Amino acid sequence: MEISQPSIGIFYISKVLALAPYATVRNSKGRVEIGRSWLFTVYSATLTVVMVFLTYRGLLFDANSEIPVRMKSATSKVVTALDVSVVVMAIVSGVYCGLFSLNDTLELNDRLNKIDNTLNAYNNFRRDRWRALGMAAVSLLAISILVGLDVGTWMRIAQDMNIAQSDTELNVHWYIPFYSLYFILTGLQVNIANTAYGLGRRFGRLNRMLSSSFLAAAAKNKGLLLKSLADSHESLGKCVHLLSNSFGIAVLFILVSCLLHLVATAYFLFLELLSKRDNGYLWVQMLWICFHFLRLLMVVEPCHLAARESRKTIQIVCEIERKVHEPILAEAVKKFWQQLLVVDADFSACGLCRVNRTILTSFASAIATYLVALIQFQRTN
């Protein structure tokens, strides 16, 4: 996990959302020293447990109420239970990763500080801060608007199904914990995306520096710069590996949540489109599909960009080789080429899969297979 001053807002968001139980102090040098915060550790654990318990209690209450709102039919019951469980698992994995990833965070931040010192010429504090804050604000505003629309639609629906001998508004009220879990999930995804995008951006800056310092006494300093760039590349690869070892289970559960959410939301939209019983519900389902796809991209695109930027440095090094005649510089470039030959750049989600754009294709196939089956089941019943 990345904790930097420009992105300190995302860190605070994750901290109040039970995902970053760390205490950060800004040194007089502008560096952010990080340590364990037991107060926030226990706060995060207790909040996660309490919110999960409340979410499942509300689910049971809806299922066991006089007039269930969402948990009405067996198919609807199972689909909504899976929808809640995927979010619960994703947030639990994120919280667990944030709790037991302090050493990885420290190592990643030290490596990033060294790399930024190496790549100080391409650092943009203002632009990085604004990008991080914009991404966080957009994600939070989108999820807030979507939650408001969903809760209003479900409130209106429950009012339509209201009977004088029972209150169905409380059934919708009891689903608030699920939306809180959604906010926590949004914060976790924002943090992961920020870290991965930072790694990819640093890879791109390293490649730009390589191409601008070698393709556009003195040779000794140039070789020193090349050695520093190679060290930065290896350190960025190790930072990617640390991010994987820390949040791979979280990313895997986020991907599973995206898949199941797309399937279930498409199924519900198809149901409402066949019955044509409501229109706001249909539009809210389309908005949910768009949000789920956007967050799937949020978790996929960063790793793909990082791998792409890291794997294109070898071509630059080959060009340098073909355009370098100095002995020691040629040897340094040869060392860099050998180092790049054996880089593991792709992001691994606990070894289950490689997080890149190809996953999307697979997802589509899965969404094309399960959804249809669900439609077939609906026709059968």
Next chain:
Amino acid sequence: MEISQPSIGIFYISKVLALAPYATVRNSKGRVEIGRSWLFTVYSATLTVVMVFLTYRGLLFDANSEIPVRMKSATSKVVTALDVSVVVMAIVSGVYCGLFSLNDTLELNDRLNKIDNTLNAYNNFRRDRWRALGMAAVSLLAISILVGLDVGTWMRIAQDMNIAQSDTELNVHWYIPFYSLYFILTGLQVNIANTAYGLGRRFGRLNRMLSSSFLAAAAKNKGLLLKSLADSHESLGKCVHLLSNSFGIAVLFILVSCLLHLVATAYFLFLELLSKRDNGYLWVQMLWICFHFLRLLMVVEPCHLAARESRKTIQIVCEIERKVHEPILAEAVKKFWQQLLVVDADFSACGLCRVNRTILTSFASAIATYLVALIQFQRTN
């Protein structure tokens, strides 16, 4: 995108079809200088928007008519809507790529000019021009014949379903925009195929030159020739990467369109074969299947050939190494081998997949899975 004098006819076809908004002037040296053409840029954008709007308006009119011709049943409505939407997305992606790919086109054409100067001995202006014109004419004639057959069959069908209190011929007339979109798609596919086949042909010419100049004072010029060949190989790889970065979304949407078209056309053919209500409709559906498969091959085979030709140069270089004793020539061949070791030859469609013949197998599986399901749905209903 490739814009060369031999293939200038394909460029003009794409230009009048809203896919190549570029102004080309032939220099006194025989070179084609390319620049932005704002008149044709706005013409392409406006034509694309207007034709898409007309296509969807005709779709809605058919769906909302007294006697729908194609958009009659829910299954038929959805299938025809997807059929129109895939074409719309493919042409929109092609137009967008042509609008925002001027720099890539310029770089690709400069690289191709340099490579052709390097490989001037194997250039065939007459044969290249005739191949390009033949491919373009065959594609346009096939799509025109297919559109005529489809529109005539649908006109006859609508006449069969005609009732004295409504006109169903106008419903078929309103589908003309969809066929115009088909023509635009054919032009885009022809342009992409021409560019990719040119890249693969240049790879093959480079390999032939390598095998004929090294396996079938003077050594200094031979090493110079080898350096030029290696530069041409790297430039061809970069041209493939430019073509990908420019038209990957277009190729991905073309592949999706081919998949969904094969599925839907097979479903319609199966419907008519069960009902046995018509024969010309069945034959037109078979012709559509053949056309879709042929264009899928048109978009797949070029990339596969390019990758195959680029990946077989390393064996030639190894043979040269084993058959070269000169010091400087041996060093140049070693450099070439190292360069070839790390080439990314496969064509990437926005990173979602690698465009090669293997895709076809996957496609078959997909076509075997979805189609069957659709058949199962038909049986259920």
Next chain:
Amino acid sequence: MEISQPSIGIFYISKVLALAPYATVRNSKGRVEIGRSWLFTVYSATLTVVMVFLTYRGLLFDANSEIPVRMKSATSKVVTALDVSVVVMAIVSGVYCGLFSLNDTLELNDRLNKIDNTLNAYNNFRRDRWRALGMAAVSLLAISILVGLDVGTWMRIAQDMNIAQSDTELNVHWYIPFYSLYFILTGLQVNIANTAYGLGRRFGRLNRMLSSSFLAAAAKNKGLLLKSLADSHESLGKCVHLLSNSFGIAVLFILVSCLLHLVATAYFLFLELLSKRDNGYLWVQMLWICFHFLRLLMVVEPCHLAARESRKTIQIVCEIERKVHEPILAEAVKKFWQQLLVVDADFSACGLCRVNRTILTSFASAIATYLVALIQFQRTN
């Protein structure tokens, strides 16, 4: 294609079966010179066309008879038509490959002669001849027994369905061409398996020679032997590539035929097991499943073995490097290691897939997917 004296029996079998239209003369040196045989070329083409026409004519006659035997229901009609068409396509592809693969055959046989001269110490004429004849005899006897069982079972069935106003035995008689196509397919598969197994066996002999001459004046001859072994390895790789370029479409159609045959035969067996209307039919279906799986292995295992044997030579070369101190021998071993680093050993079926054991797993999944669907369709109807 391989044409050697030990395996000349397989060549003659393929020749009388319209798959090897070549004239072979044994030189006084024991070498087999190969040339085009126009008499057998036209014989093969005419026989293939005539047998395909007769097979489809018998299919139509069964479908259009008073009491169809096999082509009775729409599902049965489609399944039997696909069963006949896959065999027809496989044999047509094999015949086409044999017709237009004379140059590849000549090159492969020259390369194999050179390799055998290099590996003369491990050549076993008697064992190779006996293995080839045993494989051919086993395949032909198995297909003959299976055809006899199938035709007898279908004759008995047609007698059971016989009515005084029609003869159903002629319907079974008209399916003889399909069994002739099966014999041709068996011959083609035997030839392909013999060639691929020969390539893999030569790879294994090369590896054994490497391990016995280097891991178990004089150094100059040892380096000469190593150079010959490296040349033999590259020549075996090129022979594999020639076999692919010649019979890849045939192997692809054989794989498709195996897949569809397994699916259809399992479906028919499941039908008869639900109806429990016959027992000999069930056992014949199990025998057909076993034969199809055995020939799938016959076409898969050879390529897998060849790739495995070719890819394990690099480890032997690394051991030699770690155990070689001589300068020129060390340089030769380094050259061999570099050559082995970039070998394309896997067999490619026209680029659609890599023929190895992994395919089997995919096949299973496919057989698990389509078959079930077919069962689901049967339940629906």
Next chain:
Amino acid sequence: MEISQPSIGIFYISKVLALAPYATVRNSKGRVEIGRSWLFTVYSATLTVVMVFLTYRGLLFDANSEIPVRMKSATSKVVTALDVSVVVMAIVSGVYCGLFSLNDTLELNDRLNKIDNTLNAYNNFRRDRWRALGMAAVSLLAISILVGLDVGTWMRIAQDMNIAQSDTELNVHWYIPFYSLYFILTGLQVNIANTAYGLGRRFGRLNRMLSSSFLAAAAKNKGLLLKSLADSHESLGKCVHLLSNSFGIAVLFILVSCLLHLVATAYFLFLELLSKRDNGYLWVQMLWICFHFLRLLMVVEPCHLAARESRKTIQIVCEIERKVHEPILAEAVKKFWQQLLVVDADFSACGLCRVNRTILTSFASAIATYLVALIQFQRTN
């Protein structure tokens, strides 16, 4: 297969379970010499045959009884038959591997002895013995508890279905052989997991030794140590290959058994959850699902860990290269890097698949596809 004094308990368990027909004598040096034990060879073969025959006889008796307990419906009959057959095949493959893998076992144990002598500094006899005994005891206790729960639940069920004119308790008694087969399968899986985890642990110890002896006269001994470490790495790779060549069919059948068991157990749990006819049966089905998933991990995680540990040594070697200046040590590290460049670390199950965590994802998809279909079939019927 690994046979070491710390894990001698697992060896004895496998020996009395018909999986390790070897006689082991502990030498005065503490080494375990291994040889063939014909008494235990015939005991293992006879026990396997007898238990398989009894299992299938009990299956038939249940199917042919007055009141079948498990083999009642066609769907239930097929599912239970497949459940028994997968276990039978897995245990038969394990027994066959143990019978015909004496040479591989001897080679693996010699290699492991040499490696342990090389890595003596990181050997922990007490910890290894306790881990092996704990894994064996946990597996055996879990399977025993699960078998007791299953047999008690089925006994109670058969008592519920008891009629005065027939005894259904004997039907459950006749399924004891299936549980004995389950115990044999658990022993085989424990042995395979122990061997693979030992290989991965030795890989990790080798990497730790590399990082602690090079990254945390004398140079000659350091190079000797590096040569020994490289030899140990190659020997561990060859040990992994021996384990594959010996037990790949067993691992493949174990994976198939896990897949089919998960599918069938989930189907049965879904059945009981729809009928809601019992609760203990539901909980036993959940326990069975957990046990099957845990053993799938038991067979997958070891190979993944071994490959991961073996593939991360190249990065350590690159760091050593970048941090080594001595001539002979630099040459040794270069040799080690070249050796590591071409390592085949992944475990292969007879070439059908690579055993790693990715398989799990595929499994899920399969479980998501077949299970649903089975549910669809249940709805249809």
